[PDB]
Subunit: 105 residues, 3 copies
């Protein structure tokens, strides 16, 4: 089943702030990694101080909503880039099926 994989590479200090935006979007979760890096926007600069989020979204609209909120709220003032990859989910939130009367477990 196709899904958008939204990636946000940004400053570590934004971790909780971005996790709240992701949650508010309706996305079921996110994965976050510590990283290093170098950029050319030269907002932060010309240890690892980055974080990388990967968020598998329900729709393209969901991914765009997260992206647009993060970028508008933070990217004039903080380093970061955002991009999307195409993914196909094999086992996701629905691993054990729906809840309620259509449940199979």
């Amino acid at each position: 089943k196709p899904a958008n994989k939204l990636v946000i590479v940004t400053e570590k200090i934004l971790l909780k702030k971005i996790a709240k935006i992701i949650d508010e979007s309706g996305a079921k979760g996110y994965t976050v990694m510590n990283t290093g890096g170098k950029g050319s926007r030269n907002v932060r600069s010309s240890i690892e101080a980055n974080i990388k989020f990967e968020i598998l979204t329900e729709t393209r609209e969901m991914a765009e909503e997260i992206a647009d909120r993060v970028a508008v709220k933070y990217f004039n003032d903080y380093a970061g880039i955002i991009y999307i990859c195409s993914a196909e989910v094999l086992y996701g939130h629905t691993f054990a099926g729906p809840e309620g009367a259509s449940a199979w477990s």
Copy 2:
């Protein structure tokens, strides 16, 4: 050469268990990273990890010989472990330039 990039994000304590499945599948290698995260299945036995905890999880990336190999790995991980452990599995398309 086009390839399937299988991604398994799961509890860090499954590292050796998932490496065993990968090895047994015929896959030629894997890359693994520490991560944090949050999900909605709420099956981690110890609850959601701290937001600061960027080693609750591991992420495997496995460039597989075929699509069927990636699915074999996914299916065995999931049936063996995902009722008792947190985790998700997806695939991305990759073109291998060198290595592999």
Copy 3:
């Protein structure tokens, strides 16, 4: 805008050397992670890493301007280092949204 995401997984000791290759290609930046791993080339001079060692390797992700730039980096790294050093290099398609 429709970009290439070039991925280089290789021995951590090559961090500075590959960063220089990336910078000389004209790439606007890169992201680098520690990783563990296993492969089948069996080139790494110190043998396979411990399953628990999640710092044997580095993984670079480079969003490039063109496919030509991605290829320049890849070819440079492999040709100069892959006889002697472990690693793999691949490309994923990415669409940059905020960039």
